[PDB]
Structure formats: C-alpha cells, structure tokens
Scaffold this active site. Structure first.
Site, PDB file in Angstrom:
ATOM      1  N   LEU A 106     -27.338 -47.726  -6.894  1.00  0.00           N
ATOM      2  CA  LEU A 106     -26.000 -47.788  -7.483  1.00  0.00           C
ATOM      3  C   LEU A 106     -25.976 -47.284  -8.927  1.00  0.00           C
ATOM      4  CD1 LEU A 106     -24.838 -51.242  -6.139  1.00  0.00           C
ATOM      5  CD2 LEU A 106     -24.163 -49.014  -5.171  1.00  0.00           C
ATOM      6  N   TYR A 141     -33.315 -38.918 -18.410  1.00  0.00           N
ATOM      7  CA  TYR A 141     -32.219 -38.185 -19.042  1.00  0.00           C
ATOM      8  C   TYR A 141     -32.509 -36.688 -19.144  1.00  0.00           C
ATOM      9  CZ  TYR A 141     -30.411 -42.756 -20.245  1.00  0.00           C
ATOM     10  OH  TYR A 141     -29.920 -44.039 -20.184  1.00  0.00           O
TER      11      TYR A 141
END
Lengths: 170, 171
Positions: A106, A141
C-alpha cells in the site's frame, strides 16, 4: 479492494485517529509517551487538521482496504509548502501506513499515486526531504528519479544533523 | 576594565566568521563528525550570509572583547528578523557563544546581561529565547532572570522526537 481518495470533511476525527496511531507506531519505541504527546498536542489537534483540510494549496488522502482507512498522504504546493526551495514545485510531506496494513504494497501504491498527482499538477518539480542517515530511503527515492539539490543542517542539544532535499523533474 | 562590548564593525566580517566557526566547533565537535559540522558552516557561516546579518536593520550582532581581542559574540533580533513569530512587540536573544579560551571569566553572564539591557532599551514588551526541554541547568538559570515558559515546539530527527521550550521575560 483498494481505494485512494481525498479525506472527507466528515472524516476529520478519523484522520486525527490514524495520524496519531501511525505516529505512535513509528516513534513510540524510541521516545517517551510525553514526548509523543507534545507532538500530538501541536500537530494533530482537530483545529490544525481542519485548517489543513480546508487549505486550497494542499491535499490530504486516505488509502483504504475494504472501506477501512489504512494510511494517509499529505501533499503541498504554492505557499503551503513547508519550505520555499524551488519554483513551480510540489511537495510530498507526509506518508504513513498503519502497521496492521504494512507489507501489502500500500505504501508503494500511495507514493506512486502522489507522483501521478504531481505529474497532473503541471508543475515543474516534485520534492521531498530525507534524513542524511536514511540510506535505504535514499536508494528507493533514487529509483523513481529523485536527486539531491540541497540540504539543511540544524542542532538538537549536542547533536548536529542534516536533511537532504531531493527533487524529480516533472 | 579590560572588557568591551560593541557592535561588529563592517570590516570585521572575517573575524566574525572565524569566531562563529571556532565556537561552533568547540561546542559540537566532540559529539559530531567534521563533515556534519562543515554542513552547518557551509550553510550558516559563509561570509555572504553573515554579511546579510550584519546589514539587517532588525538585528544586531555584538562582540565581547578582552583587551581588544574578540572573546565571544551575541546575536539579537526583533521585527521580521526574529527566527519565529511567536509574540507581539518582542525581542529575541538568538545566539550567544564564548570562546573556550575565555570561559569561566564571567564574560557569558556579562554579555547575557547586556542583551537584557538592550531589550529593556528597545521599548518592546517581551524578550524571549528557546531552550532544549532536556537542558535543566539552563532552564534554572533563565528562571532566575525572570524568564517563564509560554510555548513549545516539537519535531523529529530520524527516530527521535524532541521539544524546545520558549521562555519570555516581561520588559
């Protein structure tokens, strides 16, 4: 079974609840209850969250599992960004998943939703801050195309620390 | 005496950078790496940032001097130059450092007392400063000059949450 949508006006208390619970889950093992409460008392009162929900230059989202809130996402642009560091920029400020719902993908799904919102915004950059010492997050990232462009140092007691700011071209 | 307190001269910018860096190193170097400290210098104590500070109309920076040598420094703010807008008609004591070679001589107390008198002369209503929730010794000292808590700010670094208390004194 998964839905992502803005927090409803009538879900303010629900938002406070999940915001507090995730903060507790993330920070309670390494801090005292009083230290955490100081943060709740300042950042997560119904009135502060209300201003955030009504802010035109910010959005807050729930990600939901079978109609139950499993986590939340806060994004900013314009004057609502936490810091003015770039022009024509969009900030991913908060992303938490309830422990009971972690490991299900999620978090990734909500982060990917955040990047698509940024794309749709028509702004030039999406950015976020990461702790100099959080290499795992840095690596993650970097895979989405974020790159360092600045940093901010500060001190707490005897300890100096640094946050890196990373941006991704939209 | 041999002691003087006065504003930093325009032609002392490099001197200021030097003492600012040296005091920061003395205060923080034993518990942090050289690179961590350098990150702070590279951001806060370049000649250009210090220049803007010296030129700022709503802030003052002072040296305390011992026999003509800079022994420490003091930065005060008011108006929009305060680090935070927390009170109305307020004056902020932001920075106060004494070189280790000059500590224990009473210079810190003298510079803090000078700061309080500047605040009094400013005609503003409050002087304030921030103190770490865990620095009880400093708290106690501040309380003796009449400072009292009125607010706080929590934040986090990595896994650690912390709090600063804001203390004010009626002018």
């Amino acid at each position: 079974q998964v839905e992502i949508r803005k927090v409803n006006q009538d879900e303010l208390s629900l938002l406070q609840k999940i915001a507090i619970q995730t903060f507790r889950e993330t920070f309670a093992f390494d801090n005292t209850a009083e230290q955490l409460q100081n943060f709740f008392d300042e950042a997560y009162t119904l009135s502060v969250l209300k201003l955030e929900l009504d802010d035109k230059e910010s959005e807050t989202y729930f990600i939901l599992m079978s109609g139950k809130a499993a986590g939340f996402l806060k994004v900013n642009w314009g004057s609502s960004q936490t810091e003015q560091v770039l022009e024509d920029a969009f900030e991913i400020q908060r992303l938490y998943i309830l422990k009971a719902y972690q490991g299900l993908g999620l978090g990734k799904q909500l982060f990917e939703f955040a990047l698509e919102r940024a794309q749709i915004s028509g702004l030039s950059w999406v950015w976020l801050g990461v702790w100099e010492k959080n290499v795992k997050a840095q690596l993650l990232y970097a895979k989405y195309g974020f790159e360092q462009f600045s940093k901010h140092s500060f001190f707490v007691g005897n300890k100096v620390d640094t946050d890196w700011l990373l941006k991704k071209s939209l």
